[PDB]
Ligand binder design. Structure first.
Ligand code: HEM
Length: 154
C-alpha cells in the first residue's frame, strides 16, 4: 500500500501532539496493551512480574521502554513510507530474538489507536484515525514481509 500525502499529514499532525509527552503516551499505550492482552506482558522479561496497573504505573523500566518504542515508531512514521532501513534491525530483533508474532503487533496498533483517540479527540477524528490505521497496517505488512525473509513469519 501507499498513503497519499494528505493521509501522512493527518498522521504527523497527531504525532506532533504525542511528541509533546512521549513518556506519558508510552506508558498509556503499553499499559493498555498489557491490560487488554495480558499474554503480551509475558514476552517482557523485565516487566513480567508486574501484577496490577498501579504497579505498571510506577515501574520506571516500563516507562523507559515506552519511550524507546515510541521514539522508534515515530522515526518510522516521519519517513512517510521510505522506511526500509529503519525496519531491518527492528524486524531482526523482534523475529529472532524476542519472537513477537504479527498478531501482537496488531494488538499494540490497537492500543496506540485507543490512546490517541482518548487523549486527542480533536485531532483524531474518523479521517485521521483511518490515516493512522493505514500507516500502522503499512508498518505491519512491511515487517511481516521481512519476518518471512528472515525465516520467521510469526
Ligand atoms: C509499534 C511496534 C513496536 C516497536 C516500534 C517496538 C520497538 C522496540 C525497540 C526499538 C526495542 C529495543 C531494540 C530492539 O530490541 O530491537 C524493542 C525491544 C523489545 N520489544 Fe518491541 N516494539 C514494538 C512492538 C513490540 C511488541 C508488540 C512486543 C511484545 C508483545 C515487543 C516486545 C519487545 C521486547 C520483549 C523487547 C525487549 C525489551 C527489553 O528487555 O529491554 N515489541 N521494541
Amino acid at each position: 500500500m501507499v498513503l497519499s500525502e494528505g493521509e501522512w499529514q493527518l498522521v504527523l499532525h497527531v504525532w506532533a501532539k504525542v511528541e509533546a509527552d512521549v513518556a506519558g503516551h508510552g506508558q498509556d499505550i503499553l499499559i493498555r496493551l498489557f491490560k487488554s492482552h495480558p499474554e503480551t506482558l509475558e514476552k517482557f522479561d523485565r516487566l513480567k512480574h508486574l501484577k496490577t496497573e498501579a504497579e505498571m504505573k510506577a515501574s520506571e523500566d516500563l516507562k523507559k521502554h515506552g519511550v524507546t518504542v515510541l521514539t522508534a515508531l515515530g522515526a518510522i512514521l516521519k519517513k512517510k513510507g521510505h522506511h526500509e532501513a529503519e525496519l531491518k534491525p527492528l524486524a531482526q530483533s523482534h523475529a529472532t530474538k524476542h519472537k513477537i508474532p504479527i498478531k501482537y503487533l496488531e494488538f499494540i496498533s490497537e492500543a496506540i489507536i485507543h490512546v490517541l483517540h482518548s487523549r486527542h479527540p480533536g485531532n483524531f477524528g474518523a479521517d485521521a484515525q483511518g490515516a493512522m490505521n493505514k500507516a500502522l497496517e503499512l508498518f505491519r505488512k512491511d515487517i511481516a514481509a521481512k519476518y518471512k525473509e528472515l525465516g520467521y513469519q510469526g
